[PDB]
């Protein structure tokens, strides 16, 4: 703390203060040139089309598009201001699914209107150009009774829980290869789908768990398989992944309901630690 330590008559805690600054600039500059060199060389061994490892991406997780803070959907079907946040997220996500954006111009293609076999567009190389993606029509979701091209949870019912599967590069999901499984859809058929079901958390919750109504391609609960495998952002920009709208019609007002939606399959696997892998949970309650 002595004043006679910062400048006696030569300099501030050292002479000319220069041969240290020059050394570190050269030392750190040379050191930063070795870090950049090793990073660049590591990037030569990394493929530009597929990741080196994909084991950490387990069977892809299942997510619902309304981004909810605590996996809960609480609102009142009377005051409009309660559900601005819930319906604005859906509108933002579906702006890429509108028909006005899915022009061909050698990007999109008129894909099948019935669940078809997975489409192999070639090897994951640059020998071929970009890949044409199957187009998804927003009218495939719809509503039982309401407006045209509606993405709102109005006084009647609840917002359409749009269910999507996380994209995995070069992933071909396999539906269960049997009959009379844990799912019992009216239009049940093994190929070209991937069964999902939004059941209740508990037998207490399954009581008046509602009439879960699904709105997917082919009017069957699942993901059509002709949109797989995903070929990556570089090869397939503006890739329109399949959606699955779930609309709840009759549920107990002023009662917290816990809904567990699964996605059965052979490739699909579940984990006890990751609650979003293969399945997901959501709590929805409307206030009187």
């Amino acid at each position: 703390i002595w004043n006679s330590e910062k400048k006696e008559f030569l300099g501030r805690t050292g002479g000319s203060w220069f041969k240290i600054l020059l050394f570190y600039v050269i030392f750190y500059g040379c050191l930063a040139g070795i870090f950049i060199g090793t990073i660049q060389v590591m990037l030569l061994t990394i493929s530009e089309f597929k990741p080196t490892y994909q084991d950490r991406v387990a069977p892809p997780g299942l997510t619902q598009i309304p981004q909810i803070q605590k996996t809960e959907i609480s609102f009142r079907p009377n005051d409009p201001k309660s559900y601005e946040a819930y319906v604005l997220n859906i509108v933002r996500f579906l702006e890429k699914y509108k028909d006005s954006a899915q022009r061909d111009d050698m990007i999109f293609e008129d894909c099948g209107d019935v669940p078809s076999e997975p489409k192999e567009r070639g090897d994951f190389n640059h020998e071929r150009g970009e890949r044409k993606v199957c187009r998804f029509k927003l009218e495939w979701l719809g509503n039982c009774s309401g407006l045209n091209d509606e993405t709102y949870g109005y006084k009647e019912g609840k917002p359409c829980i749009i269910i999507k599967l996380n994209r995995v590069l070069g992933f071909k999901p396999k539906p269960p290869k049997n009959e009379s499984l844990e799912t019992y859809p009216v239009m049940k058929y093994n190929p070209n789908v991937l069964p999902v079901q939004c059941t209740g958390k508990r037998d207490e919750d399954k009581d008046k768990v509602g009439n879960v109504e699904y709105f997917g391609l082919g009017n069957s609960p699942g993901f059509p398989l002709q949109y797989y495998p995903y070929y990556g952002k570089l090869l397939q920009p503006k890739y329109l992944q399949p959606l699955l709208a779930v609309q709840f019609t009759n549920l107990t007002m002023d009662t917290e309901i816990r809904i567990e939606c699964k996605a059965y399959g052979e490739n699909i696997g579940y984990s006890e630690k990751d609650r979003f892998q293969g399945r997901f949970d959501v709590k929805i309650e409307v206030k009187s």
Partner: protein, 31 residues
């Protein structure tokens, strides 16, 4: 298939590599 990795084989191989190094250390100070 690039979606499964042979874990529980790296565990056995890695733990062997740990025992080999650990045993050599004991066989070095006692000498």
């Amino acid at each position: 298939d690039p979606f499964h990795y042979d874990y529980q084989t790296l565990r056995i191989g890695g733990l062997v590599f740990a025992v080999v190094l650990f045993s050599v250390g004991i066989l070095l100070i006692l000498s």
